[PDB]
Design a protein around this ligand. Structure first.
Ligand code: FRU
Ligand code: FRU
Ligand code: MN
Ligand code: MN
Lengths: 183, 182
């Protein structure tokens, strides 16, 4: 069934993300702990498709975030398009802990590490693999299709970017709604 | 006073690497060789100095890790407009240790920072912001600021618009930003 993001699911996920941040020695304030965003992308299977996000700062000039991912959690394929005169978000990912499998346009990598549910494979169209372990980075230019899945222990991945406007992101999966609906 | 030598730089790079490791911040072997050590041209690295890792710096944004040994001071400066570029805006986030940041405003009584008496004239802003791990402050462009780490040192992340270090304006006319490693 097309399941639902509940308050209890959100609380459970927020607490798990906080433990992961603490394990990686990343200090976060009590106020920030309350502002960790939990999204299941409107797909109803948070532990399959989902992200736990801390926004450190986001303004017209720049943005920085911490993306926390549970084991094998997937961020559905999307891109950050131009918005009016804004070029669109460019971002640099830096893995801080665990490992993540990032996919961008290019020649399909053989034997990719990511495992996508069979019924959703149609909504993953780019297959050039970049594996990031702690300390490693990759930069995604604006309006570029990408998606990612954490490894079997999960991941913490920093974002450094231009202004973020999540509401304007374009997803390949037409079922995705970026902004959560918590019951 | 001294000149910044290759040996002093390598010693400071190694100490900054150990501090990053203590804070559990992963860095690549390539990044270890690219940590910048500056004494701002003032010849007292352990008084005025910074060890910097630039994670990324382009036209759209910049992120750095600033490592500071106990009581290292960044001399007072601002990031000005450059042509049509507004100038760098930056957000600092303390990751480890503690740092004393000073910005324009009413002088704070009993500041935590300790500055050399003979350099006081080149520190002109005195409104104090203390940042402990997890805490942040944002400096608008063309704003005078300086900072000193606490008695354990500090690791302070920067999130900012494009960085152009060469165009920074320092209050101390003795400061030279761009290195002279002999
Ligand atoms: O909106 C989808 C998510 O994608 C990211 O850029 C990672 O690609 C996050 O900043 C964002 O919240
Ligand atoms: O150049 C002076 C230094 O000041 C900072 O913005 C911190 O204020 C660093 O990015 C820079 O390297
Ligand atoms: Mn993205
Ligand atoms: Mn600055």
């Amino acid at each position: 069934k097309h399941m639902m993001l509940t308050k209890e699911l959100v609380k459970e996920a927020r607490e798990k993300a906080i433990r992961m941040l603490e394990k990686a020695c990343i200090a976060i304030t009590d106020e920030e702990k309350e502002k960790i965003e939990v999204t299941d992308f409107g797909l109803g299977v948070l532990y399959t498709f989902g992200l736990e996000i801390l926004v450190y700062v986001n303004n017209e000039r720049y943005c920085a975030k911490e993306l926390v991912m549970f084991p094998r959690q997937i961020c559905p394929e999307h891109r950050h398009p131009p918005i009016g005169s804004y070029l669109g978000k460019q971002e640099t990912f830096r893995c801080r802990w665990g490992e993540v499998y990032l996919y961008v346009p290019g020649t399909p990598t053989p034997n990719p590490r990511a495992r996508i549910p069979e019924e959703k494979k149609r909504y993953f169209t780019v297959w050039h693999e970049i594996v990031l372990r702690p300390g490693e980075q990759y930069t995604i230019p604006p309006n570029t299709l990408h998606w990612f899945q954490a490894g079997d222990e999960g991941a913490i991945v920093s974002e450094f970017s231009s202004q973020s406007i999540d509401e304007k992101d374009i997803f390949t999966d037409p079922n995705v709604k970026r902004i959560p609906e918590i019951v």
